[PDB]
Structures are given as C-alpha cells and as structure tokens.
C-alpha cells in the first residue's frame, strides 16, 4: 500500500553488521531513494539471494541533508556504516572502473539515522530480489 513500511538494501560491504554492532548506525546514500524515505520507517538489512536473505532490520530516523558526503563524517563518521577511507576510495571505484563517473558540482547526499536495529536469527526467503539500488518494503 502507499502506506509503505520501509526500504531494504543489500549493502555493497560487509558493514551491514555496523547496525548491530553498535545498535544505533547511520546509513548514507548519494541520492538514490526518493520521498518514500521519510524520518520514522524500518530499515530491513538484507543479506544474500536463495534461502538465506535479509539478516535483520532497523528504524529510519532523523535524515541529515547535505551536499558534502564528509559533513556527515566529521559530525557522525563513527556512527555512519563506513568511514571517510571506504567514502574517497568508493568514489575513485565509481570514476575510475566505472568508464568516468565525475561530475562538474556535487549533489545532495543524506545521511539517515537508523535506531533500534533488530536481527533476523531466522534465514528469510526473499520475496523478490533485493539489487544495489535497493527496493521498498510495503505493507
């Protein structure tokens, strides 16, 4: 329904264990989701494709709006899922394998306060595939 509930994402990195390491994470995304993010959501934290997928989930919060992904490193940088060294190596990756990912400005990046990270114990089959770009949990 338009209700929704949340997003799910697989996580390019292992650091989808960051969120229940820590039980209270940030997870920042380079605009990719729109106006369906809104603070007071689930996060569902999936893991693999077959049987064994989504390892857990959390609560999506207070989402911090800027356009310099290192805003969101020096007020939270412990507390974001990676670190400012995954972030200048992860836009190299883009602009260097990926033919020239550049870009003239830079864009509005978000940075959402995920509290309340719950564990998926049980291995829960997919309902469809979870890819990169991620897909909204409905109710």
Do not use: C
Not at 86 to 96: A, C, F, N, T
Request: no cysteine; aromatic share 14%.
């Amino acid at each position: 329904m338009s209700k929704i509930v949340g997003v799910t994402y697989p996580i390019p990195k292992r650091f989808m264990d960051r969120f229940f390491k820590k039980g209270k994470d940030v997870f920042v995304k380079p605009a990719t989701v729109w106006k369906e993010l809104k603070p007071g959501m689930k996060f569902v934290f999936y893991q693999s494709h077959e049987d064994t997928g989504f390892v857990g989930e959390a609560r999506i919060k207070r989402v911090v709006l800027s356009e310099n992904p290192m805003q969101f490193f020096e007020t939270f940088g412990d507390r974001v899922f990676l670190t400012k060294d995954e972030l200048k190596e992860y836009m190299k990756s883009q602009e260097r394998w990926g033919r020239r990912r550049e870009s003239k400005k830079k864009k509005l990046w978000m940075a959402i306060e995920l509290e309340d990270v719950k564990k998926y114990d049980k291995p829960i089959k997919p309902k469809r595939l979870v890819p990169v770009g991620g897909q909204y949990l409905r109710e």
